[PDB]
Amino acid sequence: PPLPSISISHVTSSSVQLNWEQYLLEFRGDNKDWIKLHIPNNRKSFVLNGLDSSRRYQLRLAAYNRYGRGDFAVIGFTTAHK
């Protein structure tokens, strides 16, 4: 089970877009507990909406197969202002 290569874009005051090449996606406000996100299969991108502005978050993604999941690829970001 491999390590996804993830890429962030479209960083707004309330959302970010993740791109990469079953999954487990989680996010958290900085230093808080992780929240598991629903993402459908056969998706290669994901828009996380509903975030606060000017705030630090982390996203992490791991890939799944029948044997289990791999390690998490993590990205920290700060949403835009206003």
Author numbering: 495 to 515, 527 to 587
In the authors' words:
Recently, a shortened Dscam (sDscam) gene family with tandemly arrayed 5′ cassettes in Chelicerata species has been identified, which encodes ∼50–100 isoforms. Chelicerata sDscams could be classified into two subfamilies, sDscamα and sDscamβ, containing one and two variable Ig domains, respectively. Crystal structures and cell aggregation assays demonstrated that both α and β subfamilies of sDscam used Ig1 for the isoform-specific trans recognition in a hand-in-hand manner. Furthermore, the cis interactions were established by the three FNIII domains of sDscam, which assemble into a cross fold with a kink between FNIII2 and FNIII3.
We found that FNIII2 alone but not FNIII1 or FNIII3 could promote cKIT tyrosine phosphorylation, suggesting the essential role of FNIII2 domain in mediating sDscam cis interactions. The gel-filtration analysis supported our observations in the crystal structures: Ig1 mediated the formation of trans homodimer and all the three FNIII domains were involved in the cis interactions.
